[PDB]
From a paper:
During energy production in Desulfitobacterium hafniense, MtgA catalyzes the methyl transfer from methylcobalamin (Cbl‐CH3) to THF in the catabolism of glycine betaine (GB). Despite its lack of sequence identity with known structures, we could show that MtgA forms a homodimeric complex of two TIM barrels. The topology of each subunit is characterized by a funnel of eight parallel β‐sheets connected by α‐helices on the outside that form a complex of two perpendicularly oriented TIM barrels. The active‐site cavity is located inside the hydrophilic core of each barrel.
Apart from snapshots of individual reaction steps of MtgA, structure‐based mutagenesis combined with enzymatic activity assays allowed a mechanistic description of the methyl transfer between Cbl‐CH3 and THF.
Residue numbers in the entry:
A (entry chain A), B (entry chain B): 2 to 306
């Protein structure tokens, strides 16, 4: 299958994201300094294991080189002080782009203030996320930082149908669309995450990704990790049950033409990369029938066999 | 996914197979007495550990009850003596349908000859397979047995592309094709397996399954286990890398609307059931969008969470 709209392929400090199915490998986004991460001893001050963080980053580079799946780091923080330190460390200890990420918007806003309108921040920092309840101070913070790429969380807990993403992105009635809001903050590149409620509803998330790519061509992806970790029945079964079950959830959106996955904790990268790379290789082999051409030689199809 | 043709749903001794995606759970087909299966002490005579074989069968029943994925047993033999004894054991020690399976047509034919005319054989035994080298003797033997269900195997290194596998199935030029051959043997129910050449080309297998369901409405599935076991680079990595990779391969045809998977050795059932059930739950959650109704309450979506 192929999408009608010409697909946006963004180049985020070397990382290609988007395209027609089989054109580009899945971009894999691993979480670090998340709530309960054992390498963080104090989430308020940002006291973290630099050796263990470096080792996770080096492992991501090695898996990325093995499969050809590019990586963006999901950097989480619970305070301005902590997320600022986390971001400074990520900037120095990898070349990867990264998500500035937090549960609390005020943590993202505060961290942007500290980081300033640094040209490296504009090239490597992706705002996570512009959500339905965005504030003017949030858009001002993004604009002062001079950011160019954001995750658009195209999720409304009152608008669960895939077709409603057209309304959320474009706007409807008196409501400014999320794309219009991002553009006001100076954002030019939109990674669309339609949101995941639970594991089963990942099928609606992936259908929403298809609508967005079909009609607008923005790269589409999602973040099923929270839904997988709340599946206590699977998680307590141990190896390899939790891993294959996770693999089934994380690969599913890719089988329907999604462009990126937030796969959760980076410690799971070794099995996530191998499953995702397997799905990419099979999708790209289908190119041979569709005439769709790979946009890079760094593709799992040419690497993992 | 929703398929053009009206789908054929077979009821094989209580096991539902086929339909629109999300209508019925994936049927999982585990292999027993395969080459090198260590519970077999003599593969020529069919001497095996009956308690160990019973333990695999009981485990399949337990996993099936957990997820709601029905099971058919893939019963392999390398001799008429062995496959006859294997079939007699499976008849008495499970209620499940099974594949009468051998690489050697002579072994399949010989074993079928031993089993005679038996309504239990006609209801439970699925011939594996009607394939490109079929003989009139083999069709006559199937007709004498009064079998009604067969695996139609389009695996041929003279039919690599999906549309060439459809030509093998429906017939072309001087060939009646595999479906026409099965019908002359009195087969009325066709489980179509386009074959797996290698891991990457599981997408071509899946494209062939899609054409079958689009045009004919016959249940479609495949047997990717050999291709996964021959993947030295991935298998070398061990647990859980081999399994998540295997799960990516086995779930992929299900994400594109396939009806059944031969997942290889029954010992792998514990992780195969957990991955496949996960994909099924996500597919069934789509049912409102596709306009599909579940045909049963025994569905992973209603059981595994």
């Amino acid at each position: 299958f192929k999408f009608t709209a010409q697909q946006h392929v963004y180049d985020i400090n070397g990382v290609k994201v988007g395209g027609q199915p089989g054109e580009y490998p899945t971009v894999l986004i691993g979480s670090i300094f998340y709530r309960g991460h054992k390498i963080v001893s104090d989430g308020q001050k940002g006291i973290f294991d630099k050796d263990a963080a470096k080792a996770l980053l080096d492992q991501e580079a090695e898996l990325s080189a093995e499969t050809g799946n590019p990586f963006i780091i999901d950097v989480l923080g619970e305070s301005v002080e902590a997320l600022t330190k986390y971001v400074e460390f990520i900037l120095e200890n990898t070349t990867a782009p990264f998500l500035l990420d937090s549960i609390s918007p005020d943590v993202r806003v505060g961290a942007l203030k500290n980081l300033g309108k640094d040209p490296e921040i504009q090239k490597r920092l992706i705002y996570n996320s512009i959500e339905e309840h965005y504030t003017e101070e949030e858009l001002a913070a993004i604009k002062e930082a001079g950011l160019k790429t954001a995750v658009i969380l195209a999720f409304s807990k009152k608008a669960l149908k895939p077709n409603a993403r057209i309304d959320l992105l474009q706007g409807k009635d008196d409501k400014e669309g999320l794309i219009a809001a991002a553009k006001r903050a100076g954002i030019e590149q939109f990674l669309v995450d339609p949101g995941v409620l639970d594991v089963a509803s990942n099928s609606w998330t992936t259908e929403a990704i298809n609508v967005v790519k079909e009609q607008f061509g923005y790269p589409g992806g999602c973040a099923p990790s929270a839904a997988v970790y709340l599946w206590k029945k699977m998680r307590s079964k141990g190896t390899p049950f939790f891993e294959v079950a996770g693999a089934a959830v994380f690969t599913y959106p890719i089988t329907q033409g999604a462009d990126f996955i937030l796969y959760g904790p980076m410690m799971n990268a070794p099995w996530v990369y191998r499953a995702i790379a397997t799905t990419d290789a099979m999708i790209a082999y289908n190119n041979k029938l569709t005439g769709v051409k790979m946009g890079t030689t760094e593709h799992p199809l040419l690497k993992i066999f």
